Amino acid sequence: MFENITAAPADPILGLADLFRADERPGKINLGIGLYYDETGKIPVLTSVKKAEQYLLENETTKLYLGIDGIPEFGRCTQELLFGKGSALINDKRARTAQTPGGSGALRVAADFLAKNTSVKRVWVSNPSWPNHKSVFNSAGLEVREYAYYDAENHTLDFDALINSLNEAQAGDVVLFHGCCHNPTGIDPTLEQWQTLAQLSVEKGWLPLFDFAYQGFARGLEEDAEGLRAFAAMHKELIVASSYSKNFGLYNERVGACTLVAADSETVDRAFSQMKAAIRANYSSPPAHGASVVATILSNDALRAIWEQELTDMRQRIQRMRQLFVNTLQEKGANRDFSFIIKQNGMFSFSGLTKEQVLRLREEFGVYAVASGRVNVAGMTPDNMAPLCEAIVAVL
Amino acid sequence: MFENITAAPADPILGLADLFRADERPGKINLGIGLYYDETGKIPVLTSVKKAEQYLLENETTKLYLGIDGIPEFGRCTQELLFGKGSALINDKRARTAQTPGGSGALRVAADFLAKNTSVKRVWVSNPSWPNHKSVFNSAGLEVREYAYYDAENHTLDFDALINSLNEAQAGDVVLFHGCCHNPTGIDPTLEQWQTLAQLSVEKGWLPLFDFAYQGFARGLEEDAEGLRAFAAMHKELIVASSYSKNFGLYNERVGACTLVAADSETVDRAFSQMKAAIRANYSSPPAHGASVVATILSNDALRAIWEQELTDMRQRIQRMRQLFVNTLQEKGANRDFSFIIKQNGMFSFSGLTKEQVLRLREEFGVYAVASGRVNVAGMTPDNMAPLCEAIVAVL
Ligand SMILES: *Cc1c(COP(=O)(O)O)cnc(C)c1O
Ligand SMILES: *Cc1c(COP(=O)(O)O)cnc(C)c1O
Ligand SMILES: O=C(O)CCc1ccccc1
Ligand SMILES: O=C(O)CCc1ccccc1
Numbered sequence: 001m002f003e004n005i006t007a008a009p010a011d012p013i014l015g016l017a018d019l020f021r022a023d024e025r026p027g028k029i030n031l032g033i034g035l036y037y038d039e040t041g042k043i044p045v046l047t048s049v050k051k052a053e054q055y056l057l058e059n060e061t062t063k064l065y066l067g068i069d070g071i072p073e074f075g076r077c078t079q080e081l082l083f084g085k086g087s088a089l090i091n092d093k094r095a096r097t098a099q100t101p102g103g104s105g106a107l108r109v110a111a112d113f114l115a116k117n118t119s120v121k122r123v124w125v126s127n128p129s130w131p132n133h134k135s136v137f138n139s140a141g142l143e144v145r146e147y148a149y150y151d152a153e154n155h156t157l158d159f160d161a162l163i164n165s166l167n168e169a170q171a172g173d174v175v176l177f178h179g180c181c182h183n184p185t186g187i188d189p190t191l192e193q194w195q196t197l198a199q200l201s202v203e204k205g206w207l208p209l210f211d212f213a214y215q216g217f218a219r220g221l222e223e224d225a226e227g228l229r230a231f232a233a234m235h236k237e238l239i240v241a242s243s244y245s246k247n248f249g250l251y252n253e254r255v256g257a258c259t260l261v262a263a264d265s266e267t268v269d270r271a272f273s274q275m276k277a278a279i280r281a282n283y284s285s286p287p288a289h290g291a292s293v294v295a296t297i298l299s300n301d302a303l304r305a306i307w308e309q310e311l312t313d314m315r316q317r318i319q320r321m322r323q324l325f326v327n328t329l330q331e332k333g334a335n336r337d338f339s340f341i342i343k344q345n346g347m348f349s350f351s352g353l354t355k356e357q358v359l360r361l362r363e364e365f366g367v368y369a370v371a372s373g374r375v376n377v378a379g380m381t382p383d384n385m386a387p388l389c390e391a392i393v394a395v396l
Numbered sequence: 397m398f399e400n401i402t403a404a405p406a407d408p409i410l411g412l413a414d415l416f417r418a419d420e421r422p423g424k425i426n427l428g429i430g431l432y433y434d435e436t437g438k439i440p441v442l443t444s445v446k447k448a449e450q451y452l453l454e455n456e457t458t459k460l461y462l463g464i465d466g467i468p469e470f471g472r473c474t475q476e477l478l479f480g481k482g483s484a485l486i487n488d489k490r491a492r493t494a495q496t497p498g499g500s501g502a503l504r505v506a507a508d509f510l511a512k513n514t515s516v517k518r519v520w521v522s523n524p525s526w527p528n529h530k531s532v533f534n535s536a537g538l539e540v541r542e543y544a545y546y547d548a549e550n551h552t553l554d555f556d557a558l559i560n561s562l563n564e565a566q567a568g569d570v571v572l573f574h575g576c577c578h579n580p581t582g583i584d585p586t587l588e589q590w591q592t593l594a595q596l597s598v599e600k601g602w603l604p605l606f607d608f609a610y611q612g613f614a615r616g617l618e619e620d621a622e623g624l625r626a627f628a629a630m631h632k633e634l635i636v637a638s639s640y641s642k643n644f645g646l647y648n649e650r651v652g653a654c655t656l657v658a659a660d661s662e663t664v665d666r667a668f669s670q671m672k673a674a675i676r677a678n679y680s681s682p683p684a685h686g687a688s689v690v691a692t693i694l695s696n697d698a699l700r701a702i703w704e705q706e707l708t709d710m711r712q713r714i715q716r717m718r719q720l721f722v723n724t725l726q727e728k729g730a731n732r733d734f735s736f737i738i739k740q741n742g743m744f745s746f747s748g749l750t751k752e753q754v755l756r757l758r759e760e761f762g763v764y765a766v767a768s769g770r771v772n773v774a775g776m777t778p779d780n781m782a783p784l785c786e787a788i789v790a791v792l
Contacts (some may be wrong), residue, residue: 001603001633002513002666002667005514008668011672011676014680018463042457042458044457044458045457054451062438063439063645065429067411067414101497101650101682102681104679104680104681105680112535117401118397118401135673136678139508237398250459252462252682253684253685254497254679254682267398267401270402275404280531281504281531281534282504282532283498283501284498284501285650287686288648319545360538377436
């Protein structure tokens with residue numbers, strides 16, 4: 001039965017991890033996958049989390065199945081984070097949230113729900129986009145088309161080219177937007193540009209789907225939610241696929257949420273019941289650990305305070321590494337001007353390196369980046385910065 | 397977009413929990429969902445688990461994403477429990493295992509992989525069956541057909557009808573078997589019947605898929621694996637979806653696995669690359685907590701000792717409630733003879749109650765069972781036995 005199966009290619013990002021874990025080279029540097037590293041070169045568990053965990057160990061009395069949609073309080077917390085202190089979506093009970101295995105799982109859940117209960121046939125994604133967007137969508141039988149976004153010659157968001165691209169998208173089509181910290185470009189719309197896209201998508205008849213995995217890494221919690229919040233004032237319906245993997249450093253526990261919004265309560269209720277059905281046919285109910293962590297923290301004043309501080313610390317360390325990256329490239333004798341990099345946000349930097357440069361940086365110097373030229377700034381340190389910068393320079 | 401969505405009917409099993417939750421009549425009894433309860437009527441966290449968790453709290457230094465297939469240890473251990481200590485399957489490197497979110501998740505992963513990579517078009521499940529098998533397979537776009545199994549009148553496995561019904565299975569069809577503790581009948585084939593079924597399947601050209609979620613609740617860890625092991629000696633290819641929800645009381649941490657077997661290392665290798673691709677398009681990588689707990693316990697001699705004993709205690713307590721249940725029915729007024737109940741394995745009893753009978757027990761007396769008349773023996777206690785036996789009696 002399997003005699004004929006054909007070997008699949010590997011995950012361009014996660015597969016890189018195996019490549020990495022196999023060199024026996026001494027000074028290998030991982031600028032691959034989007035993990036937050038500290039000054040000392042490690043991927044720590046946050047303190048607020050360890051604290052939360054201790055609380056769980058002592059107070060949990062059962063491992064009882066959660067309801068298909070997970071922990072209710074986790075749902076509440078997600079919504080305020082998402083929409084605001086006393087938003088009307090919340091007040092009007094227009095939103096329903098299901099806890100899922102990561103934002104990756106929320107993506108799959110939204111896709112299955114769409115493909116089965118609606119007339120959606122296509123999903124529009126940005127070019128360039130996060131590689132897994134295509135796999136998830138195609139999997140549900142949906143078609144993936146791309147819209148113009150990044151201005152390569154000028155390292156900017158090419159608005160009208162974006163806008164002209166989307167003019168080809170039909171009413172009833174799905175349009176996928178990254179909430180903040182566009183992966184992999186780092187370039188986000190202005191609040192103004194967001195307001196425009198919101199007005200337009202209402203006129204054009206598009207269903208918006210937000211992939212929000214980076215809340216708090218751009219400018220802050222509440223401010224990173226502006227675009228989304230702007231869409232939300234205009235729209236009757238929308239979907240949010242959010243992740244707590246990065247802002248809580250809880251990568252392997254898979255904590256995320258799928259938030260569904262409709263014009264009103266009665267409608268969201270009916271719609272949500274079909275979402276739950278798509279869950280039931282998938283993993284049944286979500287993993288408790290990571291999400292209980294998150295609700296515990298969000299729910300406790302003290303813990304919350306410590307957590308926000310850790311988040312702000314993470315963001316600042318990255319802002320610093322970015323300034324230090326360009327300076328040293330400079331001082332190390334690079335050909336190009338790399339200052340645009342200072343203008344990107346989030347963990348990465350869409351560096352402008354070619355496929356073969358990235359390939360070379362790796363065979364030859366043990367530095368690991370994604371083929372697209374995406375480099376993990378959060379994996380940079382004062383101690384690895386020089387060697388790193390030399391490698392790049394050597395390849396340009 | 398969501399205007400015309402029809403509300404979906406709730407999960408027959410998990411939906412009962414909700415109702416259960418909203419019932420406020422004082423002495424309600426839950427014999428619905430398959431959770432293990434104790435003498436005092438609690439769903440406790442195992443002692444071996446609490447220990448392993450303390451261990452993790454103190455020794456974990458990172459939440460780094462696991463690989464698509466999970467923790468290697470977890471895989472290795474799973475295959476031993478499965479195929480036994482020094483099996484050829486393991487020695488010949490013919491099996492690959494992926495850690496998944498529960499056995500539910502393993503069922504979905506198998507489905508997507510088969511649907512996308514072979515000519516499989518139909519899955520055969522038993523009558524009666526576990527409600528979720530249908531949902532998962534259909535979602536992957538596979539046809540679900542039923543095979544005869546239980547003899548209502550004599551409360552036993554009807555081998556003939558079993559065999560006669562499968563005659564229509566075509567070569568290349570998938571046949572799904574429950575490893576031990578048939579849910580919901582509680583009737584399992586004998587070793588010799590297993591030996592027979594394994595001969596056919598090879599002759600007839602079927603791909604077997606084992607749903608193995610109750611290892612250790614019938615007779616013991618190794619005894620419970622006999623049927624599967626008998627199949628494994630004949631077959632070249634096999635699929636196993638197992639779970640640790642029940643044998644570890646880890647219901648909400650979603651711990652399970654999907655094991656793929658091929659005639660050879662190279663073949664299983666290529667085949668599993670496609671399984672990984674199906675995961676990638678789903679939830680990406682699995683939740684660490686629960687599975688780390690399992691690997692911890694299985695890889696430590698003393699924790700493993702405490703664990704095996706806890707499992708033996710659970711099994712024993714159930715067998716005790718089983719006899720007490722029949723005894724009390726009889727001694728309380730029953731018309732029927734419920735003695736056949738003693739011959740079933742696992743947590744439940746296919747009591748022979750009517751749909752209207754169960755609706756009534758719920759409505760009138762606050763007792764909760766599953767519509768098919770399946771009752772959770774593991775939810776029974778010396779203190780609730782009386783009132784429950786009376787409820788039943790009153791509806792006969
Ligand atoms: C990380 C991230 C996700 C979600 O990842 P999970 O670990 O599955 O939560 C989704 N989209 C983008 C662009 C991401 O970077
Ligand atoms: C419990 C069970 C499963 C798996 O349940 P999970 O909690 O998802 O691991 C699968 N099949 C049957 C018949 C079960 O009883
Ligand atoms: O590096 C990233 O882009 C974020 C981490 C990630 C990678 C691949 C699948 C999901 C999450
Ligand atoms: O009670 C059962 O049959 C086991 C628990 C369960 C219930 C519903 C979906 C997945 C698992």
